Amino acid sequence: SMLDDAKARLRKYDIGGKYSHLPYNKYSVLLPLVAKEGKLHLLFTVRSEKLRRAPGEVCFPGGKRDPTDMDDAATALREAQEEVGLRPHQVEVVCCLVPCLIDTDTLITPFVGLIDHNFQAQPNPAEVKDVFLVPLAYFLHPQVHDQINHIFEYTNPEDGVTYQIKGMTANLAVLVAFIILEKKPT
Ligand SMILES: COCC(=O)Nc1c(C)cc(C)cc1C
Predict the structure, then answer these.
(1) In this structure, which residue's CA is closest to atom 15 in ligand 1?
(2) Looking at the 3D structure of the chain, how many domains does it have?
(3) Is the CB of 61 under 6 A from ligand 1?
(4) Which residues face 135 on adjacent strands?
(5) DSSP secondary structure string, the chain?
(6) Alpha carbons 159 and 140: distance in angstroms, whole number
(7) Ligand 1 pocket check for 47: Cβ under 6 Å
(8) According to the UniProt entry, where does the motif Nudix box sit in this chain?
């Protein structure tokens, strides 16, 4: 099936816990995969205008590890629950992708999660201004704009709203699309 095929591809890129103990400032992100209308989509958040870092920008759910978290996957799930109301029984964490190094002292660990078909997002307005889906295939032929620095523009055909996706978020989206969609019979 489509979902069994996705998880089997993703598992080949799992680095597991190999880099998780190193002494960094630690953050995790959840890359949430949703099946709709026969195809896979990624779920994104628009950050609230009130936040200090990157107000109004597109990112994946996530945040800073705290002393309650059992492991880095726990950080990503705690934060996803707080931001969009995703409950633990509604996500299967399939793997841990390559971590992102920034600012010389920070390590961001990305997890890919498969989302239950009955989940519906409940954006928390203190943290999240908007939630939207993008079909995974978009990231193989994006609409690119140069600010020189590459920015993707995605327009939702439901309502005509345009979103800008850039930086680490855009880089991880492309990576997941390659893993799952490369070399597939039609
Ligand atoms: C200080 O925590 C780091 C951070 O960026 N947090 C955060 C992230 C990652 C995503 C969303 C949607 C909302 C928040 C508050």
Answers:
(1) 127
(2) 1
(3) yes
(4) 41
(5) -HHHHHHHHHHTT--TTTTTTSSSEEEEEEEEEEEETTEEEEEEEEEPTT-SSSTT-EE-SEEE--TT-SSHHHHHHHHHHHHH---GGGEEEEEE---EEETTTEEEEEEEEEEPTT------TTTEEEEEEEEGGGGGS--EEE---EEEEEE-TTT--EEEE-HHHHHHHHHHHHHHHSS---
(6) 23
(7) yes
(8) 64-85
C-alpha 72/C-alpha 24 separation (Å) is 12
Question: 120 phi and psi, to 5 degrees?
Answer: -130, 130
Determination approach: X-ray
Burial tier of 21 (Cβ tally within 10 Å: 0-12, 13-18, 19+): exposed
Distance of CA 169 to the CA centre of its chain: 7
Resolution (A): 2.0
- Asked if residues 169 and 59 have their Cβ atoms less than 8 Å apart, the reply is yes
Phi and psi at residue 121, to the nearest 5°:
-70, 140
* Structure-token pair, residue 58: 């597109």
Please report the atom of ligand 1 found closest to the CA of residue 64.
2
